[PDB]
Design a protein around this ligand. Structure first.
Ligand SMILES: NC(=O)C1=CN([C@@H]2O[C@H](COP(=O)(O)OP(=O)(O)OC[C@H]3O[C@@H](n4cnc5c(N)ncnc54)[C@H](OP(=O)(O)O)[C@@H]3O)[C@@H](O)[C@H]2O)C=CC1
Ligand SMILES: NC(=O)C1=CN([C@@H]2O[C@H](COP(=O)(O)OP(=O)(O)OC[C@H]3O[C@@H](n4cnc5c(N)ncnc54)[C@H](OP(=O)(O)O)[C@@H]3O)[C@@H](O)[C@H]2O)C=CC1
Ligand SMILES: COc1ccc(CCCN(O)C(=O)CC[C@@H](c2ccccc2)P(=O)(O)O)cc1
Ligand SMILES: COc1ccc(CCCN(O)C(=O)CC[C@@H](c2ccccc2)P(=O)(O)O)cc1
Ligand SMILES: [Ca+2]
Ligand SMILES: [Ca+2]
Ligand SMILES: [Ca+2]
Ligand SMILES: [Mn+2]
Ligand SMILES: [Mn+2]
Lengths: 407, 407
């Protein structure tokens, strides 16, 4: 029972965490075969990985460094990998019969495209990219209803925590992103845990003047800023709603600054189940690849006595207005989540580059949401994807226009 | 469609909690049918229950209140119960084709007899009585191996918590008290949570002086004293071992004074899952009857932000020597757990009645354990049962002898 896995975005944070936990687990017993790796342009990192894992497939997106990889790879003896390029490369990896599971560690809005081909090929897709679920949830749901054997397994830490709390005899009667997922699993309510980010004790007057420096002073810049505004958590609320079909009024954000309890599920009997560990991405990634089983790791065991104290408080929506906007957009439904995500892409980047202030982020997003009008949701998958792209591009331009008008 | 249930010990704390959650679940649909109620001698309280629930069977252990019962039940119109007595009645109830699940809320070693008969009739046994598991664990395992369709479902709060944390997809491939349970469920280690009892923060000098009045001043007296000495947790360690096939070195007692996290399971990947709620017996009791499903309750939702802080520490074995005794007795195996439980029954009662001091409890138990000589374990059921009873009585008399010698 070898687990055959492809890694998409294998030089990124997700991709490399995945290779690390695979490496360590394989030292205990040989359970994983890394069949394919795919990166943007990091051709020197890719070579190093390839030497180690000897995957059947390699792929780089950027055509420009295609030949240079072929060069690099000659050195490796014993080894005749299939070396591919761009979207046809990804498409060929997703169609191979020797690949069971695909880790999607490609960032931003980009990664949706590989997700789609993975589903079309009825794979198990370990999806870390929350923005794809928030922007294109409707399209994913439609795709997953066509391709009955395809499944998304969540890797975002809180969503993995929720999923780990479930009974798999009930999970296997449904799958993530299905209507009625929460009803089948007897889910009542979610506690979506947050770190709270750096700005959790600041007053309004202090927040008025915080800068991106304050936010960044250990993750990518975009998610770090989102953690600071708590728009990360707002996006995660929508992610929860789509993944697990939990109503917005049944998702509660709670600030847990110790980051040991990763999230909790309240069932209809009011029993609550939670997943706990040190702050970590190895277990979420591993779980996505072993589900519905678990395997041995040599990770450090949680020492609860040493951790000693766990704390929980409600976030202030006045201080973190991005959370409110995320609920508002989610409850409105339609393509409002697409608009939220896109406008936040812009506002985040503006704040990062010192072009706007903290409360301008939510102000711009709010104004874009107000200017959107709900659209007839295409019944046809292809039209639906085009609608999402159009609306995403519209909302980005609109956020930019609001910035330029005031500025 | 309805689940047909018997309640043994219906007038006690477990029994009345069971009837309360049943009452609420049956408001609109007929979810449960209460087929039988059994008590020792509380014939007035039993009458009151019979009037409300109209069970097919009533049973009193104490035959000296039979006539009183028959007289009370006359006052209920159109109600023709089968009114039984003692062991014979218990055995007839267990034999009825019309009963699916039996809640055992009878206290002390005496709970074993009804548990045994329920198993022998291939029933689902919602077992709250821990003393039966501690005293007769190896015997129940044997019985469960013979009676293939019988199941013990744990009701003790922490063990219910553990059971809930497990994946039912794996649980359904085994059953409690079965060899290999922990392997099939990928269990690594158990965090067994405790309230710590009223004496948790006392110094050694203060602890020397404690009295039963201090421990009592809200549950039955025996278990309240065991909570104060932490012999309750020691018993629960042995209960964990047997129910879940977890090695003693992989059970860690943790004092959680807020009593929200009810216990935790660490799986082989080092992910930890926990169950949490307000301190409660309705969820454990209901879950035992609905497993592997859950049903809606109107219990107050956990308000984690209001609870605000959860703490964890290791208990001092110098202060709570009963814990250490239980681990020693459990690791030694054979009939040492039987001896532990029986000597504790006496030592607890002496303390309750102001005849001995706190440290004399552990002293008596230790001396009885040291005094016991290991016996070859009978290979047949009936002989093993007789052996257990013999050793139980022996250990009680020895505890009493030790007490009498030193005063
Ligand atoms: N890791 C974490 O802790 C968390 C991650 N996430 C989610 O994870 C997602 C992935 O981000 P993360 O891994 O953290 O970030 P990174 O920026 O580190 O990941 C980028 C990776 O994707 C590759 N890539 C980018 N574009 C392409 C393309 N067109 N074709 C092929 N490969 C491409 C990059 O290749 P190259 O090296 O060549 O640039 C690199 O391997 C995000 O959407 C985020 O929401 C969510 C919560 C926390
Ligand atoms: N209380 C709790 O929340 C918890 C309890 N438990 C376990 O559950 C068990 C019961 O505890 P609890 O309910 O507090 O105990 P109680 O003292 O409250 O109740 C005991 C019950 O058993 C009945 N009974 C006693 N002897 C017999 C007999 N020979 N035949 C039939 N019925 C009998 C009593 O009848 P009568 O009224 O006639 O005396 C009463 O109904 C114990 O083993 C305890 O460890 C474990 C964890 C939690
Ligand atoms: C050393 O760097 C690492 C930090 C963290 C992690 C785990 C990934 C957490 N994750 O799912 C996120 O979505 C990131 C933002 C959230 C978070 C959660 C937990 C801890 C910190 C931040 P927030 O609640 O929105 O603030 C891994 C490595
Ligand atoms: C109103 O009705 C109710 C009755 C009962 C309970 C909870 C039963 C908990 N239980 O399983 C026991 O074994 C009791 C003793 C232990 C405990 C645990 C949690 C809280 C207090 C004490 P300890 O850790 O040994 O001290 C809750 C409510
Ligand atoms: Ca009488
Ligand atoms: Ca479970
Ligand atoms: Ca072990
Ligand atoms: Mn997250
Ligand atoms: Mn208990």
């Amino acid at each position: 029972k070898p687990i055959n896995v492809a890694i998409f975005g294998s030089t990124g944070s997700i991709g490399t965490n995945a290779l690390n936990i695979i490496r360590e687990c394989n030292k205990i017993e040989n359970v994983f075969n890394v069949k394919a790796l795919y990166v943007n342009k990091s051709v020197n990192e890719l070579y190093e990985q390839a030497r180690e894992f000897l995957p059947e497939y390699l792929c780089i997106h950027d055509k420009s460094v295609y030949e240079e990889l072929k060069e690099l790879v000659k050195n490796i003896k014993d080894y005749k990998p299939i070396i591919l390029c761009g979207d046809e490369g990804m498409k060929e990896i997703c169609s191979s019969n020797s690949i069971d599971k695909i880790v999607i560690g490609i960032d931003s809005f980009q990664g949706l495209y590989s997700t789609m081909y993975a589903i079309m090929n009825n794979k198990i897709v370990a999806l870390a990219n929350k923005e794809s679920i928030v922007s294109a949830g409707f399209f994913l749901k439609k795709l997953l209803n066509i391709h009955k054997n395809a499944k998304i397994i969540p890797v975002d830490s809180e969503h993995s925590a929720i999923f780990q709390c479930l009974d798999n005899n009930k999970v296997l009667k449904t799958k993530c992103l299905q209507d009625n997922f929460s009803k089948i699993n007897n889910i009542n309510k979610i506690f979506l845990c947050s770190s709270g980010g750096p700005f959790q004790n600041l007053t309004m007057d202090e927040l008025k003047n915080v800068t991106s420096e304050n936010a960044l002073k250990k993750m990518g810049k975009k998610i770090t800023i989102d953690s600071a505004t708590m728009m990360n958590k707002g996006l995660e609320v929508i992610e929860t709603h789509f993944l697990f079909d939990v109503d917005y009024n049944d998702i509660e954000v709670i600030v847990h600054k110790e980051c040991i309890i990763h999230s909790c599920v309240e069932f209809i009997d009011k029993s609550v189940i939670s997943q706990m560990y040190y702050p970590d991405m190895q277990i979420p990634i591993l779980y996505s690849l072993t589900w519905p089983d678990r395997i041995k790791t040599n990770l450090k065991p949680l020492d609860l006595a040493q951790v000693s104290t766990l704390t929980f408080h409600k976030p202030s929506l006045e201080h973190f207005p991005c959370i409110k906007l995320a609920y508002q957009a989610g409850i409105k439904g339609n393509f409002y989540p697409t608009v939220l995500n896109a406008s936040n892409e812009i506002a985040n980047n503006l704040f990062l580059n010192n072009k706007i202030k903290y409360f301008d982020i939510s102000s711009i997003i709010s104004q874009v949401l107000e200017s959107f009008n709900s659209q007839k949701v295409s019944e046809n998958s292809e039209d639906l994807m085009k609608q999402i792209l159009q609306i995403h591009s519209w909302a980005k331009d609109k956020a930019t226009d609001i910035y330029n008008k005031h500025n």
